[PDB]
Amino acid sequence: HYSSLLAQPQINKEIKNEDGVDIDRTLVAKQSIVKFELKTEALTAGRPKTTSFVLVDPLPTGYKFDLDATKAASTGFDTTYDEASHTVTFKATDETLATYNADLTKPVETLHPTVVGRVLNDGATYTNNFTLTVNDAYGIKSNVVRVTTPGKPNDPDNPNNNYIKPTKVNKNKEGLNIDGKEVLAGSTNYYELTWDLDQYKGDKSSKEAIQNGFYYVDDYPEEALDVRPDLVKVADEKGNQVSGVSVQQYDSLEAAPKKVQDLLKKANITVKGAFQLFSADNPEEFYKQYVATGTSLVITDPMTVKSEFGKTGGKYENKAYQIDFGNGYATEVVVNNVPKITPKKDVTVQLYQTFNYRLIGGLIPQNHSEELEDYSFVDDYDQAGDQYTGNYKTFSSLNLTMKDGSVIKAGTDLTSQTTAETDATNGIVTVRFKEDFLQKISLDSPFQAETYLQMRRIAIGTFENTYVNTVNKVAYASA
Ligand SMILES: [Ca+2]
Ligand SMILES: [Ca+2]
């Protein structure tokens, strides 16, 4: 008699987001409001009078139960919550018990409560069921329902699920990862920021979670580098361009719109000084086209070494963040070092005696980022006192390896790979390494060279002589 008390499907647990969309066995963003709806079908006619009508729902871990939201959605019940066992119980009021017992010869439609909370963890599966016991004589156990948040691989319901890991790598223009490498003055860091969106494929988040926006933050070292605002570009993982991503630079977080600071503090992101904020313009179109389709974006964010910072040297760090649906995830930190270049000069007298200016070049340290395209010696002598004979010899100052594999020994004459020229107007000798020899050198080998400029005194007295070394068209004085 009691197995036919509730009607056709009897009971049915449903799980929805805040737009009322069935999200069972699908994927939803972290912090999403998730409604457990404990539907119960009409009571058959010819029943006994209903003493009790009790639904008990043990809630899953990671689901933060909201008491006043679930009470408002469960009129006709009285809501009790056991915090120690994550269990919520709904007991039908005597007023809807009365409407269940108004005429037992007709079917009556029964009320149902709704649990309202939000999921709190990434890469978690949330399971739920509930039991309904009536008149402590029957009792029915419901079907299990599932929702999953992105962040865990090998999810059987979503085969694209994985770790939400935004990545940042430093590249030159050839695409070589230069993480941790040395970077010479005037060079540019072609930073690659990945906007990790693969795992969000199949997401059914609400329309207001999407309205929290989609952003990318880059905490760039403002004290060492300058942004190249016209070379920032957002592309998908293949190469096609992305228009719908705007970029704004802020010199400090405290000098930024209060919306932006609220954004970062609700994602637990804090920035050292200046940062960039990539925005989605219209988040809804950005969602349908990149988030819901699981197509990650790539942001090339090139920045160049300041002039002064190349002369002082030091180290700098870049770090980025990804902010989807309001939730923040952080890249690892990429580190680079700028070497301080300081060439020196000695001499090696008496009227018309020949002598050499020894011009030692700057040390290009091991494990550098960019190809050498310029290593030149520039000597501005006093033509009224000394004159340049026209002979000179350039030697490596250390052991040079390169791409073929050979190692050029320390002290080897490299003058058959140089090119001099003379400016008689100002009195300037310029010994240059050509490009095709410099661009034959491995990026992991060091580089240093010296030239001996043969000169002779043609006047009495002492005379000043300035020497300037050049590496990739940045000029270093000397002492
Ligand atoms: Ca910064
Ligand atoms: Ca001169």
Curated annotation (Swiss-Prot):
Further comment found in the protein's record: S.gordonii, a commensal oral cavity bacteria, is among the bacteria most frequently identified as being the primary etiological agents of subacute infective endocarditis (found in 13% of cases).
Gene behind the chain: sspB
Protein name: Agglutinin receptor
Binding site for Ca(2+) 2: Y163, D196, D198, Q199
Primary role: May bind sialic acid residues of salivary agglutinin (SAG) in a calcium-dependent reaction. The interaction of SAG with its receptor in various oral streptococci modulate bacterial colonization of oral tissue and is associated with reduced levels of dental caries.
Membrane spanning residue stretches: none
Subcellular location(s) of the protein: Secreted, Cell wall
Record organism: Streptococcus gordonii
Cross-link (Isoaspartyl lysine isopeptide (Lys-Asn)), chain numbering: K13-N128, K168-N318, K345-N465
Positions bound to Ca(2+) 3: D219, Y220, E222, K272, A274
